[PDB]
């Protein structure tokens, strides 16, 4: 019912495109370059919507660039607001 435990999405998405290290692959790619279409964005959705109900749809999902699923996997990423938009001027 709840996570106790979350790993990063690259060991989730990444791992539907059989990479993690991405020793020889580019990380500058567009998560649709690397092959969102179908399932990597369906996997992505029903993991952030349940463990942090961060709905962030195709369109933006697409330009996940593969380590951006973990910068957003959202753990220790919420501290507080999220990102908290607070800026004085």
């Known amino acids: 019912?709840?996570?106790?435990?979350?790993?990063?999405?690259?060991?989730?998405?990444?791992?539907?495109?059989g990479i993690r290290d991405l020793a020889g692959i580019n990380l500058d790619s567009s998560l649709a370059d690397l092959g969102l279409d179908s399932l990597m964005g369906v996997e992505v959705r029903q993991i952030l919507?349940?463990?942090?109900?961060?709905?962030?749809?195709?369109?933006?999902?697409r330009q996940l660039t593969l380590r951006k699923l973990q910068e957003?996997?959202?753990?220790?990423?919420?501290?507080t607001e999220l990102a908290a938009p607070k800026s004085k001027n």
């Open 49 to 61: 919507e349940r463990e942090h109900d961060l709905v962030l749809p195709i369109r933006e999902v």
């Open 72 to 79: 957003m996997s959202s753990k220790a990423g919420s501290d």
């Open 1 to 17: 019912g709840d996570g106790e435990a979350q790993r990063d999405l690259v060991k989730a998405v990444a791992h539907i495109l």
